[PDB]
């Protein structure tokens with residue numbers, strides 16, 4: 685449950701991401717893959733990436749970062765009213781991709797990390813609070829769908 689003020693912060697921060705969706709998407713995935721190497725194993729199309737240089741050079745990684753952040757942005761713009769947007773993602777990630785909720789925790793923290801990295805001094809305490817709550821909400825609603833499916 686986010687306040688309207690918190691949602692305003694979320695979408696204000698998102699404006700930073702939208703100015704360079706590919707660049708943000710790329711760094712988020714790289715932070716995920718290098719911080720938690722087991723997550724790379726879930727991607728048949730990225731598991732060949734052995735070095736961070738290779739990750740940085742991959743146009744397809746950037747493409748997927750765009751896909752991921754575009755989807756997340758679509759969800760965030762719904763300000764919590766995201767059942768229709770979220771259900772297919774929970775379903776594909778539980779049943780097809782088999783992504784444990786732990787990895788969604790990982791990518792949530794990676795997003796926070798990247799925002800501070802790209803916008804140091806410009807991602808204030810209040811903005812971080814609001815963004816964190818938004819990502820928790822996202823995670824929590826996926827977790828509900830996971831429980832429904834008995835997916836661990």
Ligand code: HEM
Pocket residue numbers: 723724726727728729751752753755756772773776777781783787788791
């Ligand atoms: C903000 C969090 C995330 C969002 C919004 C997101 C969104 C998406 C979307 C829109 C797709 C393509 C459509 C689909 O297959 O449902 C996708 C595919 C995929 N996602 Fe996620 N994802 C997220 C997190 C993750 C994480 C943390 C992992 C693994 C650690 C992951 C693994 C995958 C894989 C393996 C695919 C298929 C890629 C392919 O082979 O083309 N996702 N994701």
